[PDB]
Symmetry: C3
Subunit: 207 residues, 3 copies
């Protein structure tokens, strides 16, 4: 009888003013938009749409605007305070987790690094492939028997697409490859948010 709940570990694309935990996380989508976007309600987000329309509950949305998977941010800055690998332990007690990241690592120019599936050092976690592997490894152990789905944004560099896809395959994690997402200011529009939700449902109907 009890419906499965979903948490989100995301970035700008999964933020919405007043729905972020911790509440100090940076927001991209406001009720009264700050940037030029047509999205003005949480009901229009990809995650609220998917959760509400597929009979799920909302658990924790730990999304942070401009966050990278790894600890190298924009202009080589240290993003250890806001990275996905730092925030992965605060997602409540969900039944399903969506990971929606890697866009910022792609556009920040974070070093891609080498594939590393164990013995991660502090130096390694400043590069992408070791941080992506460390994320999935630690989350599989932290969230036993929780369904984990990686959402891969459309329009990223192929080196990030292939890295995300290879590391997800290593850990047997489903990687949902988003395509043709309609964007405004490089972020999903109302149409784009609907396309993300319908593409997740397509992937669930196939899998």
């Amino acid at each position: 009888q009890s419906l499965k709940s979903i948490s989100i570990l995301g970035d700008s694309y999964s933020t919405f003013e007043g729905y972020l935990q911790p509440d100090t996380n940076s927001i991209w989508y406001y009720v009264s938009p700050r940037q030029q976007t047509d999205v003005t309600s949480v009901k229009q987000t990809w995650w609220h749409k998917f959760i509400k329309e597929n009979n799920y509950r909302l658990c924790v949305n730990n999304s942070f605007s401009g966050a990278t998977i790894c600890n190298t941010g924009y202009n080589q800055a240290d993003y250890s305070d806001r990275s996905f690998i730092t925030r992965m332990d605060k997602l409540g007690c969900p039944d399903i987790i969506f990971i929606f990241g890697a866009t910022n690592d792609c556009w920040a120019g974070s070093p891609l690094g080498d594939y590393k599936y164990e013995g991660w050092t502090k130096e390694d976690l400043y590069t992408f492939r070791p941080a992506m592997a460390y994320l999935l490894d630690h989350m599989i152990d932290r969230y036993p028997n929780v369904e984990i789905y990686f959402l891969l944004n459309s329009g990223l560099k192929e080196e990030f697409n292939e890295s995300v896809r290879a590391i997800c395959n290593h850990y047997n994690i489903d990687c949902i490859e988003l395509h043709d997402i309609d964007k405004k200011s490089g972020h999903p529009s109302i149409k784009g948010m609907e396309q993300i939700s319908e593409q997740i449902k397509m992937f669930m109907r196939k899998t």
Copy 2:
């Protein structure tokens, strides 16, 4: 297999010493009573009784003694720190939510205001109908696919009964109208707590 969990967004009637989140919320019911009441145990509360007896789990009880639904309190004081519309975002991750409020808005003499179903300003949420509507609107979005039930106390002014009932109907929220609840010092007694719990079951059953 996994049993549904319940959270409460209440006021004096749903408080019990040591069961409130955040733990800094004002309590009405203490283990050793400080008010004239016969209730001395959490096992006697309407919410513990309903949850335990109908095979549910307890999630979060966010109840605050004397808290109003809107931001106008007793003697026209600003209750923005304790109102239901301020505390509605901290109820854990439940399967069911009970909202049990409007008694303090009724006895504080909070301005009733006009019905407003969008564009709520800071000024509007100091009045009852806009705050009621803002509460249900925001909670439906914050708690998708969570069963929400408004519990309406017995003995309130008809302007508050009718406002609560009209705003619940707008948002398609069940409003359980409590009747003849036995009280001591204006708060449910052991009998009253049992009557609240039995009246919720009969609403569920029908």
Copy 3:
């Protein structure tokens, strides 16, 4: 479809670096061991093993290294800040709770006290039997319809074994009596953690 979640209220034996809530709790098991033990991963702990292998989810692990059930610690120190009866209210919203304590009360030499099933004072809760009853009483009310299991460590003094067993019987709580748990530095080894997990599965099947 939604799987039951489990929370742990433990001591040294249920700790693991990075899996404790609150994160300020004392840890015994580190990734790189500080004490002489062969355990180096959360995957080897009795609780992660049981949860992962019996198709459950992890809720909250509130374990504190060296914490006592009652408020008297080692060398008659006041353990009111870290006792089980102080920490019992912060276990999330689980479907099942494991209580794994009393080892420290046994080796600290905490006063055993008299059996007391009501009217507990601050003075009473410095002794074992009143604190152990206060723990089960308050947790049954705080966690309605949650399955509660007391795990009793092997090799403790019989006065503690018999007290725990009598107080669990009073409150109709299952007391899982662990036997022959393989230990290193007085704490479960990899073998010991597997024996705890298999003995919980065995108890669950016969009850």
